[PDB]
């Protein structure tokens, strides 16, 4: 395992989901960027590991499951086995990390990506160590029922830029958004 990262799209109210769905219409290019960031390995013969809560897994259209090109890990305490189409099940992020160390994925994993939900992000955001947040800011309010936790600027620095990430305002379906990379180490 190389790097530990979290990727999220968030509305101005810090909304990440509404009844397990996206609180905004589809954003095909925001989606393509998500697929591109998470799938791309920085080391031949390696694939990235994607981690998600039970509920983020079930919110992905059946058709898109598993996220292809990546090892899919579902994080749950109630599940006794991995949902159909998933590859591994861990009780916590710590257990999910340890598994990496097993010669199991040890030699097979480049980067690890946390793709949801608040719980899983909240807990990654507290794992001590180096972490990067790839945030997609949707520049409007959307009714939500679940939120991203508060980013601590005394801890994470917004990078002035990052290679492979557009720096300017994007626009799809009359909804503007921008990409931000935060970095922490502690
Ligand atoms: C959350 O509601 C849905 C519905 C469909 C769906 O994938 C097809 C998803 C997954 C999805 C999509 N875009 C993202 N976009 C970003 N930037 N970050 C995410 N973590 C993310 C996720 C988890 C989430």
mmCIF file with all atom_site columns, C-alpha atoms and ligand atoms in Angstrom:
data_model
loop_
_atom_site.group_PDB
_atom_site.id
_atom_site.type_symbol
_atom_site.label_atom_id
_atom_site.label_alt_id
_atom_site.label_comp_id
_atom_site.label_asym_id
_atom_site.label_entity_id
_atom_site.label_seq_id
_atom_site.pdbx_PDB_ins_code
_atom_site.Cartn_x
_atom_site.Cartn_y
_atom_site.Cartn_z
_atom_site.occupancy
_atom_site.B_iso_or_equiv
_atom_site.pdbx_formal_charge
_atom_site.auth_seq_id
_atom_site.auth_comp_id
_atom_site.auth_asym_id
_atom_site.auth_atom_id
_atom_site.pdbx_PDB_model_num
ATOM   1   C CA  . UNK A 1 1   ? 0.000   0.000   0.000   1.00 0.00 ? 1   UNK A CA  1
ATOM   2   C CA  . UNK A 1 2   ? 1.093   3.422   -1.109  1.00 0.00 ? 2   UNK A CA  1
ATOM   3   C CA  . UNK A 1 3   ? -1.143  6.286   -0.138  1.00 0.00 ? 3   UNK A CA  1
ATOM   4   C CA  . UNK A 1 4   ? -4.291  6.678   1.985   1.00 0.00 ? 4   UNK A CA  1
ATOM   5   C CA  . UNK A 1 5   ? -6.901  9.058   0.338   1.00 0.00 ? 5   UNK A CA  1
ATOM   6   C CA  . UNK A 1 6   ? -10.565 9.988   0.696   1.00 0.00 ? 6   UNK A CA  1
ATOM   7   C CA  . UNK A 1 7   ? -12.555 11.316  -2.288  1.00 0.00 ? 7   UNK A CA  1
ATOM   8   C CA  . UNK A 1 8   ? -15.984 12.999  -1.873  1.00 0.00 ? 8   UNK A CA  1
ATOM   9   C CA  . UNK A 1 9   ? -18.407 15.343  -3.777  1.00 0.00 ? 9   UNK A CA  1
ATOM   10  C CA  . UNK A 1 10  ? -20.116 17.723  -1.133  1.00 0.00 ? 10  UNK A CA  1
ATOM   11  C CA  . UNK A 1 11  ? -22.774 20.479  -1.584  1.00 0.00 ? 11  UNK A CA  1
ATOM   12  C CA  . UNK A 1 12  ? -22.447 23.878  0.061   1.00 0.00 ? 12  UNK A CA  1
ATOM   13  C CA  . UNK A 1 13  ? -24.444 22.564  3.086   1.00 0.00 ? 13  UNK A CA  1
ATOM   14  C CA  . UNK A 1 14  ? -21.818 19.741  3.361   1.00 0.00 ? 14  UNK A CA  1
ATOM   15  C CA  . UNK A 1 15  ? -24.405 17.273  2.080   1.00 0.00 ? 15  UNK A CA  1
ATOM   16  C CA  . UNK A 1 16  ? -23.126 13.983  0.690   1.00 0.00 ? 16  UNK A CA  1
ATOM   17  C CA  . UNK A 1 17  ? -26.329 11.879  0.294   1.00 0.00 ? 17  UNK A CA  1
ATOM   18  C CA  . UNK A 1 18  ? -30.122 11.949  0.377   1.00 0.00 ? 18  UNK A CA  1
ATOM   19  C CA  . UNK A 1 19  ? -31.783 8.518   1.049   1.00 0.00 ? 19  UNK A CA  1
ATOM   20  C CA  . UNK A 1 20  ? -28.656 6.737   -0.018  1.00 0.00 ? 20  UNK A CA  1
ATOM   21  C CA  . UNK A 1 21  ? -28.676 8.725   -3.318  1.00 0.00 ? 21  UNK A CA  1
ATOM   22  C CA  . UNK A 1 22  ? -26.740 11.710  -4.580  1.00 0.00 ? 22  UNK A CA  1
ATOM   23  C CA  . UNK A 1 23  ? -28.605 14.882  -3.566  1.00 0.00 ? 23  UNK A CA  1
ATOM   24  C CA  . UNK A 1 24  ? -27.923 16.463  -7.065  1.00 0.00 ? 24  UNK A CA  1
ATOM   25  C CA  . UNK A 1 25  ? -28.531 15.246  -10.614 1.00 0.00 ? 25  UNK A CA  1
ATOM   26  C CA  . UNK A 1 26  ? -25.799 13.073  -12.204 1.00 0.00 ? 26  UNK A CA  1
ATOM   27  C CA  . UNK A 1 27  ? -22.471 14.673  -13.090 1.00 0.00 ? 27  UNK A CA  1
ATOM   28  C CA  . UNK A 1 28  ? -21.009 12.431  -15.691 1.00 0.00 ? 28  UNK A CA  1
ATOM   29  C CA  . UNK A 1 29  ? -17.687 14.324  -15.798 1.00 0.00 ? 29  UNK A CA  1
ATOM   30  C CA  . UNK A 1 30  ? -17.543 14.576  -12.007 1.00 0.00 ? 30  UNK A CA  1
ATOM   31  C CA  . UNK A 1 31  ? -18.195 10.775  -12.207 1.00 0.00 ? 31  UNK A CA  1
ATOM   32  C CA  . UNK A 1 32  ? -15.445 10.171  -14.765 1.00 0.00 ? 32  UNK A CA  1
ATOM   33  C CA  . UNK A 1 33  ? -12.937 12.014  -12.562 1.00 0.00 ? 33  UNK A CA  1
ATOM   34  C CA  . UNK A 1 34  ? -14.001 9.790   -9.636  1.00 0.00 ? 34  UNK A CA  1
ATOM   35  C CA  . UNK A 1 35  ? -13.450 6.633   -11.769 1.00 0.00 ? 35  UNK A CA  1
ATOM   36  C CA  . UNK A 1 36  ? -10.146 8.079   -13.107 1.00 0.00 ? 36  UNK A CA  1
ATOM   37  C CA  . UNK A 1 37  ? -8.785  9.134   -9.643  1.00 0.00 ? 37  UNK A CA  1
ATOM   38  C CA  . UNK A 1 38  ? -9.694  5.815   -7.964  1.00 0.00 ? 38  UNK A CA  1
ATOM   39  C CA  . UNK A 1 39  ? -8.756  3.433   -10.696 1.00 0.00 ? 39  UNK A CA  1
ATOM   40  C CA  . UNK A 1 40  ? -5.334  4.725   -11.787 1.00 0.00 ? 40  UNK A CA  1
ATOM   41  C CA  . UNK A 1 41  ? -2.330  2.976   -10.217 1.00 0.00 ? 41  UNK A CA  1
ATOM   42  C CA  . UNK A 1 42  ? 0.979   4.697   -9.903  1.00 0.00 ? 42  UNK A CA  1
ATOM   43  C CA  . UNK A 1 43  ? 2.862   1.327   -10.166 1.00 0.00 ? 43  UNK A CA  1
ATOM   44  C CA  . UNK A 1 44  ? 2.468   -1.355  -12.866 1.00 0.00 ? 44  UNK A CA  1
ATOM   45  C CA  . UNK A 1 45  ? 0.791   -4.638  -11.938 1.00 0.00 ? 45  UNK A CA  1
ATOM   46  C CA  . UNK A 1 46  ? -0.831  -2.875  -9.013  1.00 0.00 ? 46  UNK A CA  1
ATOM   47  C CA  . UNK A 1 47  ? -4.470  -1.951  -8.542  1.00 0.00 ? 47  UNK A CA  1
ATOM   48  C CA  . UNK A 1 48  ? -5.910  0.428   -5.954  1.00 0.00 ? 48  UNK A CA  1
ATOM   49  C CA  . UNK A 1 49  ? -8.037  -0.731  -3.011  1.00 0.00 ? 49  UNK A CA  1
ATOM   50  C CA  . UNK A 1 50  ? -11.456 1.138   -2.651  1.00 0.00 ? 50  UNK A CA  1
ATOM   51  C CA  . UNK A 1 51  ? -13.062 1.070   0.857   1.00 0.00 ? 51  UNK A CA  1
ATOM   52  C CA  . UNK A 1 52  ? -16.797 1.990   1.484   1.00 0.00 ? 52  UNK A CA  1
ATOM   53  C CA  . UNK A 1 53  ? -19.533 1.542   4.122   1.00 0.00 ? 53  UNK A CA  1
ATOM   54  C CA  . UNK A 1 54  ? -22.365 -0.937  3.543   1.00 0.00 ? 54  UNK A CA  1
ATOM   55  C CA  . UNK A 1 55  ? -24.673 1.834   2.526   1.00 0.00 ? 55  UNK A CA  1
ATOM   56  C CA  . UNK A 1 56  ? -22.316 3.419   -0.019  1.00 0.00 ? 56  UNK A CA  1
ATOM   57  C CA  . UNK A 1 57  ? -22.009 -0.040  -1.585  1.00 0.00 ? 57  UNK A CA  1
ATOM   58  C CA  . UNK A 1 58  ? -25.748 -0.467  -1.900  1.00 0.00 ? 58  UNK A CA  1
ATOM   59  C CA  . UNK A 1 59  ? -26.190 3.062   -3.303  1.00 0.00 ? 59  UNK A CA  1
ATOM   60  C CA  . UNK A 1 60  ? -24.078 2.142   -6.396  1.00 0.00 ? 60  UNK A CA  1
ATOM   61  C CA  . UNK A 1 61  ? -26.198 1.086   -9.350  1.00 0.00 ? 61  UNK A CA  1
ATOM   62  C CA  . UNK A 1 62  ? -25.983 -2.799  -9.388  1.00 0.00 ? 62  UNK A CA  1
ATOM   63  C CA  . UNK A 1 63  ? -24.509 -2.507  -12.839 1.00 0.00 ? 63  UNK A CA  1
ATOM   64  C CA  . UNK A 1 64  ? -21.515 -0.546  -11.565 1.00 0.00 ? 64  UNK A CA  1
ATOM   65  C CA  . UNK A 1 65  ? -20.765 -3.190  -8.870  1.00 0.00 ? 65  UNK A CA  1
ATOM   66  C CA  . UNK A 1 66  ? -18.030 -3.997  -8.147  1.00 0.00 ? 66  UNK A CA  1
ATOM   67  C CA  . UNK A 1 67  ? -16.134 -0.777  -9.160  1.00 0.00 ? 67  UNK A CA  1
ATOM   68  C CA  . UNK A 1 68  ? -14.093 -2.430  -11.880 1.00 0.00 ? 68  UNK A CA  1
ATOM   69  C CA  . UNK A 1 69  ? -10.355 -2.291  -11.977 1.00 0.00 ? 69  UNK A CA  1
ATOM   70  C CA  . UNK A 1 70  ? -10.149 -1.953  -8.168  1.00 0.00 ? 70  UNK A CA  1
ATOM   71  C CA  . UNK A 1 71  ? -10.310 -4.241  -5.104  1.00 0.00 ? 71  UNK A CA  1
ATOM   72  C CA  . UNK A 1 72  ? -13.686 -3.509  -3.450  1.00 0.00 ? 72  UNK A CA  1
ATOM   73  C CA  . UNK A 1 73  ? -13.774 -3.661  0.340   1.00 0.00 ? 73  UNK A CA  1
ATOM   74  C CA  . UNK A 1 74  ? -17.049 -3.114  2.262   1.00 0.00 ? 74  UNK A CA  1
ATOM   75  C CA  . UNK A 1 75  ? -16.658 -2.031  5.884   1.00 0.00 ? 75  UNK A CA  1
ATOM   76  C CA  . UNK A 1 76  ? -19.460 -3.328  8.175   1.00 0.00 ? 76  UNK A CA  1
ATOM   77  C CA  . UNK A 1 77  ? -20.023 -4.745  11.645  1.00 0.00 ? 77  UNK A CA  1
ATOM   78  C CA  . UNK A 1 78  ? -23.402 -6.360  10.976  1.00 0.00 ? 78  UNK A CA  1
ATOM   79  C CA  . UNK A 1 79  ? -22.425 -8.179  7.753   1.00 0.00 ? 79  UNK A CA  1
ATOM   80  C CA  . UNK A 1 80  ? -21.047 -11.676 8.279   1.00 0.00 ? 80  UNK A CA  1
ATOM   81  C CA  . UNK A 1 81  ? -19.868 -12.020 4.644   1.00 0.00 ? 81  UNK A CA  1
ATOM   82  C CA  . UNK A 1 82  ? -19.171 -9.541  1.815   1.00 0.00 ? 82  UNK A CA  1
ATOM   83  C CA  . UNK A 1 83  ? -22.262 -8.507  -0.177  1.00 0.00 ? 83  UNK A CA  1
ATOM   84  C CA  . UNK A 1 84  ? -22.636 -10.197 -3.508  1.00 0.00 ? 84  UNK A CA  1
ATOM   85  C CA  . UNK A 1 85  ? -20.043 -8.775  -6.027  1.00 0.00 ? 85  UNK A CA  1
ATOM   86  C CA  . UNK A 1 86  ? -17.753 -7.330  -3.262  1.00 0.00 ? 86  UNK A CA  1
ATOM   87  C CA  . UNK A 1 87  ? -14.324 -8.735  -2.524  1.00 0.00 ? 87  UNK A CA  1
ATOM   88  C CA  . UNK A 1 88  ? -13.537 -8.307  1.220   1.00 0.00 ? 88  UNK A CA  1
ATOM   89  C CA  . UNK A 1 89  ? -15.353 -7.337  4.384   1.00 0.00 ? 89  UNK A CA  1
ATOM   90  C CA  . UNK A 1 90  ? -13.707 -5.699  7.375   1.00 0.00 ? 90  UNK A CA  1
ATOM   91  C CA  . UNK A 1 91  ? -15.163 -4.660  10.669  1.00 0.00 ? 91  UNK A CA  1
ATOM   92  C CA  . UNK A 1 92  ? -13.126 -1.383  10.781  1.00 0.00 ? 92  UNK A CA  1
ATOM   93  C CA  . UNK A 1 93  ? -10.547 0.712   8.743   1.00 0.00 ? 93  UNK A CA  1
ATOM   94  C CA  . UNK A 1 94  ? -7.776  -0.646  10.966  1.00 0.00 ? 94  UNK A CA  1
ATOM   95  C CA  . UNK A 1 95  ? -8.872  -4.184  10.193  1.00 0.00 ? 95  UNK A CA  1
ATOM   96  C CA  . UNK A 1 96  ? -9.109  -3.140  6.513   1.00 0.00 ? 96  UNK A CA  1
ATOM   97  C CA  . UNK A 1 97  ? -5.550  -1.775  6.730   1.00 0.00 ? 97  UNK A CA  1
ATOM   98  C CA  . UNK A 1 98  ? -4.097  -4.801  8.523   1.00 0.00 ? 98  UNK A CA  1
ATOM   99  C CA  . UNK A 1 99  ? -5.485  -6.979  5.634   1.00 0.00 ? 99  UNK A CA  1
ATOM   100 C CA  . UNK A 1 100 ? -3.223  -4.982  3.312   1.00 0.00 ? 100 UNK A CA  1
ATOM   101 C CA  . UNK A 1 101 ? -0.239  -6.157  5.336   1.00 0.00 ? 101 UNK A CA  1
ATOM   102 C CA  . UNK A 1 102 ? -1.345  -9.778  4.985   1.00 0.00 ? 102 UNK A CA  1
ATOM   103 C CA  . UNK A 1 103 ? 0.658   -11.115 2.003   1.00 0.00 ? 103 UNK A CA  1
ATOM   104 C CA  . UNK A 1 104 ? -2.899  -11.184 0.714   1.00 0.00 ? 104 UNK A CA  1
ATOM   105 C CA  . UNK A 1 105 ? -2.899  -7.711  -0.891  1.00 0.00 ? 105 UNK A CA  1
ATOM   106 C CA  . UNK A 1 106 ? 0.437   -6.675  0.517   1.00 0.00 ? 106 UNK A CA  1
ATOM   107 C CA  . UNK A 1 107 ? 2.092   -7.006  -2.895  1.00 0.00 ? 107 UNK A CA  1
ATOM   108 C CA  . UNK A 1 108 ? -1.086  -6.218  -4.882  1.00 0.00 ? 108 UNK A CA  1
ATOM   109 C CA  . UNK A 1 109 ? -2.169  -2.750  -3.610  1.00 0.00 ? 109 UNK A CA  1
ATOM   110 C CA  . UNK A 1 110 ? -0.962  0.659   -4.757  1.00 0.00 ? 110 UNK A CA  1
ATOM   111 C CA  . UNK A 1 111 ? -3.208  3.387   -3.201  1.00 0.00 ? 111 UNK A CA  1
ATOM   112 C CA  . UNK A 1 112 ? -6.244  3.052   -0.894  1.00 0.00 ? 112 UNK A CA  1
ATOM   113 C CA  . UNK A 1 113 ? -9.282  5.205   -1.521  1.00 0.00 ? 113 UNK A CA  1
ATOM   114 C CA  . UNK A 1 114 ? -12.135 5.855   0.967   1.00 0.00 ? 114 UNK A CA  1
ATOM   115 C CA  . UNK A 1 115 ? -15.237 6.582   -1.042  1.00 0.00 ? 115 UNK A CA  1
ATOM   116 C CA  . UNK A 1 116 ? -17.962 7.003   1.671   1.00 0.00 ? 116 UNK A CA  1
ATOM   117 C CA  . UNK A 1 117 ? -19.966 7.364   3.975   1.00 0.00 ? 117 UNK A CA  1
ATOM   118 C CA  . UNK A 1 118 ? -19.570 9.980   6.745   1.00 0.00 ? 118 UNK A CA  1
ATOM   119 C CA  . UNK A 1 119 ? -18.728 7.380   9.226   1.00 0.00 ? 119 UNK A CA  1
ATOM   120 C CA  . UNK A 1 120 ? -15.967 5.920   7.200   1.00 0.00 ? 120 UNK A CA  1
ATOM   121 C CA  . UNK A 1 121 ? -14.613 9.374   6.407   1.00 0.00 ? 121 UNK A CA  1
ATOM   122 C CA  . UNK A 1 122 ? -14.988 10.620  9.937   1.00 0.00 ? 122 UNK A CA  1
ATOM   123 C CA  . UNK A 1 123 ? -12.882 7.651   11.096  1.00 0.00 ? 123 UNK A CA  1
ATOM   124 C CA  . UNK A 1 124 ? -10.245 8.003   8.293   1.00 0.00 ? 124 UNK A CA  1
ATOM   125 C CA  . UNK A 1 125 ? -9.875  11.726  9.116   1.00 0.00 ? 125 UNK A CA  1
ATOM   126 C CA  . UNK A 1 126 ? -8.813  10.750  12.612  1.00 0.00 ? 126 UNK A CA  1
ATOM   127 C CA  . UNK A 1 127 ? -6.456  7.892   11.646  1.00 0.00 ? 127 UNK A CA  1
ATOM   128 C CA  . UNK A 1 128 ? -3.090  9.546   12.468  1.00 0.00 ? 128 UNK A CA  1
ATOM   129 C CA  . UNK A 1 129 ? -0.628  9.458   9.594   1.00 0.00 ? 129 UNK A CA  1
ATOM   130 C CA  . UNK A 1 130 ? -0.571  11.102  6.152   1.00 0.00 ? 130 UNK A CA  1
ATOM   131 C CA  . UNK A 1 131 ? -3.880  11.597  4.398   1.00 0.00 ? 131 UNK A CA  1
ATOM   132 C CA  . UNK A 1 132 ? -5.222  13.518  1.453   1.00 0.00 ? 132 UNK A CA  1
ATOM   133 C CA  . UNK A 1 133 ? -8.772  14.580  0.892   1.00 0.00 ? 133 UNK A CA  1
ATOM   134 C CA  . UNK A 1 134 ? -9.882  15.002  -2.745  1.00 0.00 ? 134 UNK A CA  1
ATOM   135 C CA  . UNK A 1 135 ? -13.020 17.190  -2.378  1.00 0.00 ? 135 UNK A CA  1
ATOM   136 C CA  . UNK A 1 136 ? -15.470 18.067  -5.126  1.00 0.00 ? 136 UNK A CA  1
ATOM   137 C CA  . UNK A 1 137 ? -17.302 21.256  -4.002  1.00 0.00 ? 137 UNK A CA  1
ATOM   138 C CA  . UNK A 1 138 ? -20.803 21.560  -5.518  1.00 0.00 ? 138 UNK A CA  1
ATOM   139 C CA  . UNK A 1 139 ? -21.412 25.223  -5.370  1.00 0.00 ? 139 UNK A CA  1
ATOM   140 C CA  . UNK A 1 140 ? -25.037 25.063  -4.209  1.00 0.00 ? 140 UNK A CA  1
ATOM   141 C CA  . UNK A 1 141 ? -27.409 23.785  -1.532  1.00 0.00 ? 141 UNK A CA  1
ATOM   142 C CA  . UNK A 1 142 ? -29.062 20.411  -1.900  1.00 0.00 ? 142 UNK A CA  1
ATOM   143 C CA  . UNK A 1 143 ? -31.430 18.815  0.661   1.00 0.00 ? 143 UNK A CA  1
ATOM   144 C CA  . UNK A 1 144 ? -29.444 16.093  2.367   1.00 0.00 ? 144 UNK A CA  1
ATOM   145 C CA  . UNK A 1 145 ? -29.785 13.671  5.262   1.00 0.00 ? 145 UNK A CA  1
ATOM   146 C CA  . UNK A 1 146 ? -26.085 12.775  5.532   1.00 0.00 ? 146 UNK A CA  1
ATOM   147 C CA  . UNK A 1 147 ? -22.990 15.104  5.695   1.00 0.00 ? 147 UNK A CA  1
ATOM   148 C CA  . UNK A 1 148 ? -19.178 15.178  5.345   1.00 0.00 ? 148 UNK A CA  1
ATOM   149 C CA  . UNK A 1 149 ? -17.493 16.051  8.679   1.00 0.00 ? 149 UNK A CA  1
ATOM   150 C CA  . UNK A 1 150 ? -15.937 19.497  9.232   1.00 0.00 ? 150 UNK A CA  1
ATOM   151 C CA  . UNK A 1 151 ? -12.462 19.858  7.721   1.00 0.00 ? 151 UNK A CA  1
ATOM   152 C CA  . UNK A 1 152 ? -9.928  21.256  10.266  1.00 0.00 ? 152 UNK A CA  1
ATOM   153 C CA  . UNK A 1 153 ? -7.783  23.878  8.468   1.00 0.00 ? 153 UNK A CA  1
ATOM   154 C CA  . UNK A 1 154 ? -5.375  23.944  11.409  1.00 0.00 ? 154 UNK A CA  1
ATOM   155 C CA  . UNK A 1 155 ? -4.689  20.372  10.377  1.00 0.00 ? 155 UNK A CA  1
ATOM   156 C CA  . UNK A 1 156 ? -5.260  20.062  6.611   1.00 0.00 ? 156 UNK A CA  1
ATOM   157 C CA  . UNK A 1 157 ? -3.805  22.461  4.065   1.00 0.00 ? 157 UNK A CA  1
ATOM   158 C CA  . UNK A 1 158 ? -5.669  23.177  0.858   1.00 0.00 ? 158 UNK A CA  1
ATOM   159 C CA  . UNK A 1 159 ? -2.932  22.653  -1.884  1.00 0.00 ? 159 UNK A CA  1
ATOM   160 C CA  . UNK A 1 160 ? -2.524  25.602  -4.371  1.00 0.00 ? 160 UNK A CA  1
ATOM   161 C CA  . UNK A 1 161 ? -2.777  22.937  -7.037  1.00 0.00 ? 161 UNK A CA  1
ATOM   162 C CA  . UNK A 1 162 ? -2.380  19.297  -7.788  1.00 0.00 ? 162 UNK A CA  1
ATOM   163 C CA  . UNK A 1 163 ? -1.328  17.489  -11.012 1.00 0.00 ? 163 UNK A CA  1
ATOM   164 C CA  . UNK A 1 164 ? -4.239  15.889  -12.972 1.00 0.00 ? 164 UNK A CA  1
ATOM   165 C CA  . UNK A 1 165 ? -6.907  17.926  -11.188 1.00 0.00 ? 165 UNK A CA  1
ATOM   166 C CA  . UNK A 1 166 ? -8.471  20.903  -12.969 1.00 0.00 ? 166 UNK A CA  1
ATOM   167 C CA  . UNK A 1 167 ? -8.176  24.107  -10.868 1.00 0.00 ? 167 UNK A CA  1
ATOM   168 C CA  . UNK A 1 168 ? -11.084 26.075  -12.349 1.00 0.00 ? 168 UNK A CA  1
ATOM   169 C CA  . UNK A 1 169 ? -14.875 26.031  -11.943 1.00 0.00 ? 169 UNK A CA  1
ATOM   170 C CA  . UNK A 1 170 ? -16.627 23.234  -13.804 1.00 0.00 ? 170 UNK A CA  1
ATOM   171 C CA  . UNK A 1 171 ? -20.125 23.238  -15.001 1.00 0.00 ? 171 UNK A CA  1
ATOM   172 C CA  . UNK A 1 172 ? -22.652 20.606  -15.689 1.00 0.00 ? 172 UNK A CA  1
ATOM   173 C CA  . UNK A 1 173 ? -26.398 20.860  -15.891 1.00 0.00 ? 173 UNK A CA  1
ATOM   174 C CA  . UNK A 1 174 ? -26.352 24.470  -14.641 1.00 0.00 ? 174 UNK A CA  1
ATOM   175 C CA  . UNK A 1 175 ? -24.583 23.383  -11.396 1.00 0.00 ? 175 UNK A CA  1
ATOM   176 C CA  . UNK A 1 176 ? -20.973 24.696  -10.926 1.00 0.00 ? 176 UNK A CA  1
ATOM   177 C CA  . UNK A 1 177 ? -18.370 22.731  -8.875  1.00 0.00 ? 177 UNK A CA  1
ATOM   178 C CA  . UNK A 1 178 ? -14.604 22.941  -8.235  1.00 0.00 ? 178 UNK A CA  1
ATOM   179 C CA  . UNK A 1 179 ? -11.920 20.357  -7.163  1.00 0.00 ? 179 UNK A CA  1
ATOM   180 C CA  . UNK A 1 180 ? -9.746  20.767  -4.027  1.00 0.00 ? 180 UNK A CA  1
ATOM   181 C CA  . UNK A 1 181 ? -6.919  18.597  -2.604  1.00 0.00 ? 181 UNK A CA  1
ATOM   182 C CA  . UNK A 1 182 ? -6.267  18.826  1.149   1.00 0.00 ? 182 UNK A CA  1
ATOM   183 C CA  . UNK A 1 183 ? -3.275  17.312  2.798   1.00 0.00 ? 183 UNK A CA  1
ATOM   184 C CA  . UNK A 1 184 ? -2.579  16.316  6.330   1.00 0.00 ? 184 UNK A CA  1
ATOM   185 C CA  . UNK A 1 185 ? 0.318   14.611  8.171   1.00 0.00 ? 185 UNK A CA  1
ATOM   186 C CA  . UNK A 1 186 ? 0.237   14.130  11.983  1.00 0.00 ? 186 UNK A CA  1
HETATM 187 C C1  . LIG B 2 .   ? -24.220 8.350   -3.424  1.00 0.00 ? 1   LIG B C1  1
HETATM 188 O O1  . LIG B 2 .   ? -25.224 8.109   -4.412  1.00 0.00 ? 1   LIG B O1  1
HETATM 189 C C2  . LIG B 2 .   ? -24.660 7.507   -5.537  1.00 0.00 ? 1   LIG B C2  1
HETATM 190 C C3  . LIG B 2 .   ? -25.207 7.029   -6.657  1.00 0.00 ? 1   LIG B C3  1
HETATM 191 C C4  . LIG B 2 .   ? -24.386 6.495   -7.657  1.00 0.00 ? 1   LIG B C4  1
HETATM 192 C C5  . LIG B 2 .   ? -23.022 6.431   -7.486  1.00 0.00 ? 1   LIG B C5  1
HETATM 193 O O2  . LIG B 2 .   ? -22.114 5.881   -8.371  1.00 0.00 ? 1   LIG B O2  1
HETATM 194 C C6  . LIG B 2 .   ? -22.587 5.523   -9.669  1.00 0.00 ? 1   LIG B C6  1
HETATM 195 C C7  . LIG B 2 .   ? -22.459 6.910   -6.311  1.00 0.00 ? 1   LIG B C7  1
HETATM 196 C C8  . LIG B 2 .   ? -20.977 6.831   -6.039  1.00 0.00 ? 1   LIG B C8  1
HETATM 197 C C9  . LIG B 2 .   ? -20.112 8.052   -6.043  1.00 0.00 ? 1   LIG B C9  1
HETATM 198 C C10 . LIG B 2 .   ? -20.182 8.906   -7.155  1.00 0.00 ? 1   LIG B C10 1
HETATM 199 N N1  . LIG B 2 .   ? -19.470 9.983   -7.341  1.00 0.00 ? 1   LIG B N1  1
HETATM 200 C C11 . LIG B 2 .   ? -18.588 10.280  -6.370  1.00 0.00 ? 1   LIG B C11 1
HETATM 201 N N2  . LIG B 2 .   ? -17.888 11.395  -6.627  1.00 0.00 ? 1   LIG B N2  1
HETATM 202 C C12 . LIG B 2 .   ? -16.962 11.725  -5.769  1.00 0.00 ? 1   LIG B C12 1
HETATM 203 N N3  . LIG B 2 .   ? -16.254 12.841  -6.022  1.00 0.00 ? 1   LIG B N3  1
HETATM 204 N N4  . LIG B 2 .   ? -16.708 11.059  -4.609  1.00 0.00 ? 1   LIG B N4  1
HETATM 205 C C13 . LIG B 2 .   ? -17.383 10.008  -4.301  1.00 0.00 ? 1   LIG B C13 1
HETATM 206 N N5  . LIG B 2 .   ? -16.979 9.468   -3.140  1.00 0.00 ? 1   LIG B N5  1
HETATM 207 C C14 . LIG B 2 .   ? -18.394 9.485   -5.190  1.00 0.00 ? 1   LIG B C14 1
HETATM 208 C C15 . LIG B 2 .   ? -19.189 8.341   -5.046  1.00 0.00 ? 1   LIG B C15 1
HETATM 209 C C16 . LIG B 2 .   ? -19.113 7.389   -3.863  1.00 0.00 ? 1   LIG B C16 1
HETATM 210 C C17 . LIG B 2 .   ? -23.289 7.416   -5.352  1.00 0.00 ? 1   LIG B C17 1
#
